[PDB]
Structure formats: C-alpha cells, structure tokens
Design a protein around this ligand. Sequence first.
Ligand code: HEM
Ligand code: HEM
Ligand SMILES: [C-]#N
Ligand SMILES: [C-]#N
Lengths: 191, 191
Amino acid sequence: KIPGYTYGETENRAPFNLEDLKLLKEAVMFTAEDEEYIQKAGEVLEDQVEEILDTWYGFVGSHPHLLYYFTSPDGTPNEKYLAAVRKRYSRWILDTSNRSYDQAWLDYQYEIGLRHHRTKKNQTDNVESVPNIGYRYLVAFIYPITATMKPFLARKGHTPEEVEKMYQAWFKATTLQVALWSYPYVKYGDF
Amino acid sequence: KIPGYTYGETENRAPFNLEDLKLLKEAVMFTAEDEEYIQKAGEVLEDQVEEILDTWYGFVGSHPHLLYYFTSPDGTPNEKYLAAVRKRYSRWILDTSNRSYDQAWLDYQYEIGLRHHRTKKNQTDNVESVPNIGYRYLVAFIYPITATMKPFLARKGHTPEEVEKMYQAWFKATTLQVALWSYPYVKYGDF
Ligand code: HEM
Ligand code: HEM
Ligand SMILES: [C-]#N
Ligand SMILES: [C-]#N
C-alpha cells in the first residue's frame, strides 16, 4: 500500500541487537510505562495525522536550508519526493506507537538512518536530490518532532498528566530512534 | 579556579561558525524568546547545582554501562575523574544559561565534543579510562538531561507556563549542544 515502505523486509540486519536496545532504552529512561503511553499516544494521534503532517512539513518548508533536503538540482522542492516520504512518515507515527521494539523494528531503524544518510538517500523514491542530510540536523530535529506532537496530544480531552506522560514517551522514543539512526553517520567504532 | 575548564581559552577554532549556529538554532526552533527563558532557567538553577549534580551523577552511577565511561581500566570508578568532571558540568549549567552563544561559545562546544570523543577523552584530567564515549549515548542523554532539570525549574515558584518555557528552552539548548558535540564522531563531510 505504501511505496518504499519495507518494514520487516529490509535487505540488511541492523548492526545493533536487542541487548544494545535494552541498554539504550535505559539511557533514555524508557520503561514498560512508556510502552503503555506510546501506545496511548498513537490512539490520540492516529486520526490527526493529516494535520500533524501539515504541521511537520510546514516547519520543514519554512526554512530554505531544511526544505533543501527535498529539493531537485534546480533548488525547487521535488513534490514527488515530498509526497512519497510523507506517506512513510505517516506510517512511522503509527509504527512508533504500535510496533514491538524487536529486531525487525531495529532493522527498520537502521534502514531509516541509511535513508537520511548518503548511503541510501534518494534511492527509495528514485529521485534526484541532495546526497546527504547533514547529521547536525537529524539530532536537532528531536526537538521539533516533540514540539510538533505536543499540541495534538492534548486535543482528545486527556488529563494534563496523561498528556505529559504521552509527550514524554514520545520524546524518549524519538531520542531513542535518532540515536539508532546515527549509526551510518558515525565513524566506525565510535557508535 | 576550575581545573580543566578552558572556556574562551581553547587551542582550536571550531569547524562551525555563527552562520552555522543561526541555521542550527532554526532547526531546534530556538529564538529570542528562548534566550529570555534560558537566562531565567539559570537564575532558578544556580543555587540548586549541588542537588542537580547529585541527581545527574546518581542517574549515571546507577547504570553500570553508563558509569563505565568514568572507570579505570580495572573496571572500578575513578573518583578523581568523577569529581573533576563534576566541577566542569556544574559550570556548564551556568554557561548554558548565562553565556552569549558566540564564537567563543562555539569553540567551547567543539572542545566538549572532543572531550567525550576519543580525540580528547581522559586528557583534561590526565586520567586513564575508557577511550571513547559511544555516540549512541550522547544522543540518548538529551532525554535524561532534560528530565533531570525539569523538577528543579519549578522550585522557585514560577508559573506553570514559565516553568514550561524554561524547560522547553533547556531542551532546545541541550539538543543544540549535542548536535554540535557530534562533530568529531561524524564521518568527515556528513555533519
Ligand atoms: C527526529 C528526526 C527525524 C525524524 C523522526 C524523521 C522521520 C522520517 C521518516 C519516518 C522518514 C521515512 C522513513 C522511511 O523511508 O520509511 C523520513 C525520511 C526522510 N526525511 Fe526525515 N526524519 C527526521 C529528520 C530529518 C531531517 C533533519 C530532514 C531534513 C530536512 C529530513 C528529511 C527527510 C528526507 C529528505 C527523507 C527521505 C530520505 C530518502 O531519500 O529515503 N528528516 N524521515
Ligand atoms: C546530553 C548529553 C551530555 C551532556 C549535556 C554532558 C555534559 C558534560 C559536561 C558539561 C562535561 C564537562 C565539559 C568540560 O570539560 O568543560 C562532560 C564531560 C564528560 N562527560 Fe558528559 N555530557 C553528556 C553526555 C555524556 C555521556 C552519555 C556520558 C557517558 C557516561 C558522559 C560522561 C562524561 C565523561 C566521562 C566526561 C569527561 C570527559 C573527559 O575525559 O574530558 N557524558 N559532560
Ligand atoms: C523527515 N521528514
Ligand atoms: C556528562 N556528565
């Protein structure tokens, strides 16, 4: 249903395993409590995805140096690229909320990292665009991901403490993912 | 003074400049509005630093794979190392809140990244310890840094809205810094 989306059918095994993941979850203070609240976050976000996507890509589109990563050689946004990625980002919202964080999840996290990185960027959609997303901005984007989700998490009449727990779970899960996605960017042996 | 603390006295110019910083601030949604609240955060945190340090190093100390980065080759924690770093971390709380984010600030950011990385780790305190802090944990630590600061930000009686603004400012500034500290870890040209 979703072009380019290959969760559970990636070509590579991730260079990290469930033991690595356990230790990283501990570093981001992610526990069974957050598994519960990330699932609840999904329930709240699921029917708000179109507005989330508009808010997220609105932010990206608001800064030329960010929109840059979706541009054709002529400096204009590649609309085919944007539209195809948007469908996979929509799915990532659900995957973050609903998937077991097992080896298949890890294998896809590695894949997503490879796709932001020069290793695989522009291959999934067969587009001509910029070769690499500078790592500085991947880390940076942990923040706007959280700031984007925050208002939507409060829109279904949950208690502010329930919202805070969903927001913190999202923050933890996003940090965890970007940590994993960093692998292809990091000098070998330094990850 | 503070042994090893060389803010404004670094040997190298950072590989990033104020134009890089402007673009990265935009990526973390940091504006003039956050400058106000990061300064306020400093006013709130300053006389609570001992408790903050105890909480932070309490978290690190409670996980063998994190405390690991302060250990001597025989696996035992190096208490001299811990104590010396603690003094510099205490200063970093104030610098984040009080310094102009100019080229001197950027130069020290580069230096802090080099000190977590194998490039300079263990040199400042002339200790023998683990050669490198795996980058996965630098990213991960954005979360617990923010989680550690949050309760302290509310202890001076500011409104929930002001506390939230201080917290969000701290989150942005932490993410911004970790993005810069990634430089020595990232494959050359991919940052
Ligand atoms: C917290 C940080 C980020 C998150 C959570 C995120 C999320 C995602 C997701 C879910 C996908 C689709 C993955 C798939 O193929 O299944 C994707 C791809 C993509 N993202 Fe991001 N992203 C982040 C950082 C960034 C940044 C900084 C940029 C720069 C504008 C960016 C631009 C893109 C582009 C251009 C693609 C397509 C890559 C390709 O050619 O395959 N992303 N992102
Ligand atoms: C958001 C992430 C982090 C922040 C804000 C932070 C903060 C700091 C600060 C302010 C310093 C002193 C810098 C100076 O010399 O002036 C430092 C050094 C140090 N930190 Fe971190 N840190 C982070 C990640 C980590 C992680 C994941 C570890 C692993 C336990 C760690 C362990 C250490 C060690 C061992 C040093 C001494 C390095 C050296 O030999 O010079 N830090 N950190
Ligand atoms: C990424 N969007
Ligand atoms: C780092 N402490």
